[PDB]
Amino acid sequence: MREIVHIQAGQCGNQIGAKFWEVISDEHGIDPTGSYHGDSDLQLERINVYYNEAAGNKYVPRAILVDLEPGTMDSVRSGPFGQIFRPDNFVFGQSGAGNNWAKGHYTEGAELVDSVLDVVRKESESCDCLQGFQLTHSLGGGTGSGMGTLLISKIREEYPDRIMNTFSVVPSPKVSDTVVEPYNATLSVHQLVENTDETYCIDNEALYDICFRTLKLTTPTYGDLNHLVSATMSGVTTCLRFPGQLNADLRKLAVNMVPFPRLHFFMPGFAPLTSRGSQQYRALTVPELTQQMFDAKNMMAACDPRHGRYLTVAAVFRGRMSMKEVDEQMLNVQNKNSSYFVEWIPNNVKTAVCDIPPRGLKMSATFIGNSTAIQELFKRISEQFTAMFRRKAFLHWYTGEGMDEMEFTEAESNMNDLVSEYQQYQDAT
Amino acid sequence: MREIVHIQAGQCGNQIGAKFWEVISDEHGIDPTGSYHGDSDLQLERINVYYNEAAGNKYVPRAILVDLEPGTMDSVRSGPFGQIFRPDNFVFGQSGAGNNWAKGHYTEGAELVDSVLDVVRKESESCDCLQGFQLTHSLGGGTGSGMGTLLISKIREEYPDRIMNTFSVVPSPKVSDTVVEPYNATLSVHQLVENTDETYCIDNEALYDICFRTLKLTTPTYGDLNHLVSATMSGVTTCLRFPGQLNADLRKLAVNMVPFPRLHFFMPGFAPLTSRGSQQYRALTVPELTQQMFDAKNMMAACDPRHGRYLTVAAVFRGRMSMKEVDEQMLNVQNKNSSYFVEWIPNNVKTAVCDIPPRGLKMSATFIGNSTAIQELFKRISEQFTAMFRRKAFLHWYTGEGMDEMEFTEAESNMNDLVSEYQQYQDAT
Amino acid sequence: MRECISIHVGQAGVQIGNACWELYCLEHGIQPDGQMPDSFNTFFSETGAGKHVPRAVFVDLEPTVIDEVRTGTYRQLFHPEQLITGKEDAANNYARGHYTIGKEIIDLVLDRIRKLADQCTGLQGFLVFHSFGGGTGSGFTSLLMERLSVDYGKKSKLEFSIYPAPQVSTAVVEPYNSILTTHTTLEHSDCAFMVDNEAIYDICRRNLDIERPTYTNLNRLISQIVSSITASLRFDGALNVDLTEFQTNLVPYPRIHFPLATYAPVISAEKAYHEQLSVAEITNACFEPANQMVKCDPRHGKYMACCLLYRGDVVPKDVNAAIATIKTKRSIQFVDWCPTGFKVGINYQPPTVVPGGDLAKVQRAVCMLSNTTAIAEAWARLDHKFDLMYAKRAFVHWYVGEGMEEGEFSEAREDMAALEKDYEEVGVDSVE
Amino acid sequence: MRECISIHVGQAGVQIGNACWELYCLEHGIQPDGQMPDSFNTFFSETGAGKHVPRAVFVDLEPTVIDEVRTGTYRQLFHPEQLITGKEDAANNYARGHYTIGKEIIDLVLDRIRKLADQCTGLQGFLVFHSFGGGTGSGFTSLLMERLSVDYGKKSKLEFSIYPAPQVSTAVVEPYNSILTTHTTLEHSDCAFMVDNEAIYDICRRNLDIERPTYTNLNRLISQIVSSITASLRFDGALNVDLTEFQTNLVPYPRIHFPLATYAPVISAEKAYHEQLSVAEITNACFEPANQMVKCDPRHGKYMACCLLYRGDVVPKDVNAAIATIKTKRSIQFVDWCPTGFKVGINYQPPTVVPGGDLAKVQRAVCMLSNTTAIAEAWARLDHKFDLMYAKRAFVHWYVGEGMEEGEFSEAREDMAALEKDYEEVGVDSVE
């Protein structure tokens, strides 16, 4: 009941998912072999939401792994927890992405998407009552952008009522991994505003700061950065995998956070985050969770929330706590920060309380916040997009794959139809 | 209830506070780890006034440590009781003071004060009902003067009704540590007369005498001098941390000692003080406390109280004693020394009695006296200030940091508006 | 299974290959016999026995330098049907490279490439290692780049050329051979990397403190660049890159595909101490104008795009701090239409040390592949040397008599002058 | 993390540095190889291995004295890109130091300073160790102090010069080189400490009872002063001081920044007994006019400001008694406008003893940095020697032919005479 099909895409979407299933297996007590070595009995009550029971008390994940080159799949199956995925789910092509959106969504996307959807449809007909999908990709590359938004356009035709949320990795402001990443982002946001139901914008630059300013790490590798994202992905559905006092799911956080069907770009946050030699001086109580969420050095998107207005705010708490002390802290941050919220929505803080903490901590929270401070996120992409498109530079790699300027012009015009909404409701009354 | 936020500044304000928290922890029974190893139960009744309860029965001090160079903070965290402070409170800069007021209050003060007040505001919103702050600095240096008076100007804008007292170290008459210390004192008293509520003037020269004339020490290091100041800082709030017969606090000693809002510069005194091999010949009774306070070899300021007049006098007694024998001694010193007090204030001796002595002694007192004998303190600074300013010497280090002569002239004119008040009420009737 | 074959043309191509394939064998423990006591399946093909052969085709018109391979130490490694030779050299002549001698064995080489293309399925692209100077490296290459775009087409073709130095020129007719081979490869090549000889002499004299380097010591430093480009295919990295991804991020317009390579750190073994060599230190050694391996001042022009290829014990956070300081400097400037000008690649394997070498065992190394408009000054002086010699019609009687239209020079110069104003179109800024 | 690099210019700069960096290694147990079996991170940089290198840049125009370091005992300690040499010396010539030879390698030294400035974050200031006598120590320094105030500016620049003796003068043209290098450093330096050679001969003859000292024995006593100034950065003290704090408390006017250094106790090992050496004893040995290390009688002028730097087992109360008796004496007098004329600094670490030396292991030592107007008599006689030689236009033909305006002498002398009357402005008292 209420199953979730997990879809991965690209180099980055694999290396998030290969760390994501390492966290879920440690919450349910699953070895790298695939068996069960748990201690309690609450871990197997809702095991069907991500795991299908195989023959012989083994549980395999409901994951679908997509890439255009076999290089990243070669390291996922050979690493830890790589012997738990079913080998039929590794759907990879021999050509290669080329770090291009045209080779991701038009040329090599169509040669592969008819073979991916034989795996998506097989997993969807095996579940009892499907809740909704989820996707992990990145807007910078070619496979996570081109092949990643191609799957959503095919799924939403087949499954309209099922929810579809993506954990994107929006490119950083200062540094830039890909030279043509404004083209790979502008041609991807145009697909996500009409095909998904909610979208989690994550910046790499906001994750390098938290490992340097809060956790105080000398050498944070991508195993350290992607462990924070995987803790937030599990923190949204944690009211579905475990019983609680006030239960939520992927639909309650979709209704109460999305007021208009185009405004569904979020920013995630996690609490608590302590340093190594400073986790004993800190009083790890309930109002320590509240003061660590709302400050701007804990957001996972490189944008200051003080510039905008929070439309809707979701707080998903975990662990045995009290309900008065939640409503004490969530109200006081709405009175002293009374200007940074919005006026025409009264009482816009959503509360959800689970019962089981993550492995290691005593209690924890998860911040799922919507804001108009992400208009700075699209005014920076659309500035870099029009700076490159007006010279028609890097365009023959896109035009040579069957593409015209109307594909670009209707993409940039749609983004300025999105900026003119977040600027509108920030000043409405 | 009635919490106190402790702020430190400079090289001297750290080495007083690093000895100050060593005395408070020995009164409440706190190890250098941070746990509790007490014997009675009165030590944990009012533990919240300086310590915040952490997770796991540990108590961390409510201290905020400020410096412009990391040199002094490197020795505080590595010394004894240095592992008890929270590592977020160590707010230090990389530039360096330079022993200059212009680099303390204008240039490097503004680059740091916006980061200090994120720690001050966080500790102030954690307390239940705030009593008032306190500050430990020195008027000679640059960080304790420039950065020290910059914090008071920012706090008094945010928290007007809360009390603000400073434990300054006024520079000595004969020797001089800093060459430009009249500039660093005259530009600091101009800030303290309009921003603090009471101020404790302490001279180094008066502390070298007591270790040489009274305690008879061969080699008094600064561990020996700063142990006397830290015993007086705890002796003011000792009626707040422990129950008594006639209770006081930082507000009763602020109302009853300050008749006019500019006259709030005090002089502290402590009793009893015995020598090493002479603490058995002395009858340590109640009138031995009285005769050791009022004589001029026990004041902590290098100024003779016989030249002036006591306006208000506070005596804070500790230990199980009787109330008649207090009022016997406090009255007889007001009849035989009838000229050295003032005429237009009848019965100007304030009494406060606690119940718990310091660790080691049977009973003790604390003298908080106001006087017009500190007009000798400002007639010596203003004489040295006008002796240097009329040649305009050492002035391009101040003028080169954005400063004019009107900053100096309105500072020296304010001090002569303070000398003309203490000379006025000494001869009033 | 991302395979890639490499083609070595001319004497400058082969003597780079003898130092490249020396390096690939030592990274995977391959003996000179091909034996060894997976990830290396890209540049090799394990046979039925335990023997590995390279996916390389050496080709030359003279049998001198190929007999070094057939008689030297790496003798049993190469398949003897790959080492294609000829009777007589082209001998500093583009016409003998493309019309007379090159037409006689071009059918034999394409037969050998197609026998190496059929046993691979993840064939990304090619690697042509040639030189603009000689006859075979220019004439036979310009014939070869035509025959590959006809047959294959979609595969990303890369070139590691040897650009002629501004002052040191061995052959006299290098302005003739450089223009005629760039008129032809401009339509077919996708990215042609530039490496100059004279700038490597400036590095080996100053940094390594070797007063007398030979061509062997120059081929060691070239093969370190060749390794660090194809390092992401042969190992696992935190942020990989492929050969299809170089042509997308460094070639903005189809006429501008001439980057320049830069490697760091290049220091001696006695100087390998005394300094810690962090990524914030060795990244600025790439953009320093004294360590670039093409004799062109980068402050004369603007950087269009750059590609940093880190390898070794490299922290991904400290890369982000190292690139961010470069965009704050004032001597380094980018073009106005390119706000995002970096391609970042991190690999885990540290660079290995060939024995008998001069560089030391380090923990990290950076290969920069930057595409700047500072090369536009270098194309101007090469067109200035071509206009001086052709005004007197010097050396033309060799090229006419070997089957070439005399007016083909006038068609080559007008096409190169069209390339010259294309950098002027890029370098200007925009209105509003 | 309060870091500080030091620059050694000229032969007098280097041979002080060979006795300074001998002393810093022995205080922290550093081997001559740089190894050792924290607090010393100011004057070193620990690399990836367990090896520490100095933050020093030796520079000289002649390759003679630098080859002592490259071949001697302290060979593996210094980074070989720091030891910057030249072909030919300036050879007692300010014009070759600033116009001809100094202009050819000034771009190389600033590149090496900027590579040591980027890896530090608590960089307080510099330490230029030069001499007024020679060509490189004066000409190349005056060029160097211009290039640092342009680039850095805010950092406190200190100098430990070697002031020429009133009677003992090795070079003949020392009145020419001293004026031309003081006309230039007057606008850029913040505090230039004076140490004279002849006054150290008077101390080594009388106090230490050594009849024949060499330049090695003089460089031991200089480096003790260099250690005691930077002792508060490298260790913990009861009352510290920083290099930014010297320029604030000793330079009252921007034209008067010439103090003089004085060290005590300087006694032999056989005389290390028979006396107890308390702080009330050794403080008056500093203000005694026979132990000052500049040949200037301090009773002719007035003390503007003084800086006592105690170190060792020093009681803070007994310092207060020791300074208070000095202000009661009658021969010691201060200027009228400065009532508070002392800067006090106490450090805990006792001064160490270099083996093969002449001073003994003591428990405490005082370094005095006093700024007096008794140096104004010394500037008068140096201007008296300059006016005698320039009246006959002697030695001018060397300086004109090496690229210098002939009237620049007349601009230098009028600026120095303006410095001469500035001490007369200070020495007078005030009305009322």
Ligand SMILES: Nc1nc2c(ncn2[C@@H]2O[C@H](COP(=O)(O)OP(=O)(O)OP(=O)(O)O)[C@@H](O)[C@H]2O)c(=O)[nH]1
């Ligand atoms: N980098 C590098 N360049 C080399 C080397 N040997 C020769 N060259 C350069 O190659 C050019 C000469 O052309 P070659 O490659 O020898 O001629 P070819 O293409 O083999 O053909 P022929 O002229 O017919 O023999 C000059 O620019 C030389 O500097 C070498 O070992 N390394």
Ligand SMILES: Nc1nc2c(ncn2[C@@H]2O[C@H](COP(=O)(O)OP(=O)(O)OP(=O)(O)O)[C@@H](O)[C@H]2O)c(=O)[nH]1
């Ligand atoms: N304190 C000290 N002074 C020295 C020493 N050796 C030489 N001097 C002084 O240095 C001056 C001579 O000038 P140099 O410093 O040697 O000249 P230079 O700057 O190195 O450059 P050139 O004149 O070009 O060789 C005289 O005043 C000497 O007394 C030494 O070991 N210690």
Ligand SMILES: Nc1nc2c(ncn2[C@@H]2O[C@H](COP(=O)(O)OP(=O)(O)O)[C@@H](O)[C@H]2O)c(=O)[nH]1
């Ligand atoms: N957080 C995170 N981002 C990554 C990781 N690997 C790659 N990325 C990001 O992914 C983007 C590059 O796209 P990529 O997925 O490799 O290309 P594609 O395979 O063609 O889709 C850049 O924005 C990188 O910052 C990783 O391990 N963690």
Ligand SMILES: Nc1nc2c(ncn2[C@@H]2O[C@H](COP(=O)(O)OP(=O)(O)O)[C@@H](O)[C@H]2O)c(=O)[nH]1
């Ligand atoms: N009582 C006492 N005074 C001290 C101590 N350390 C320094 N001082 C005094 O502090 C002043 C020097 O100021 P300092 O704090 O070092 O400079 P700053 O850091 O720039 O503020 C002088 O008046 C010293 O006498 C100490 O441990 N105890």
Ligand SMILES: [Mg+2]
């Ligand atoms: Mg050849």
Ligand SMILES: [Mg+2]
């Ligand atoms: Mg010399």
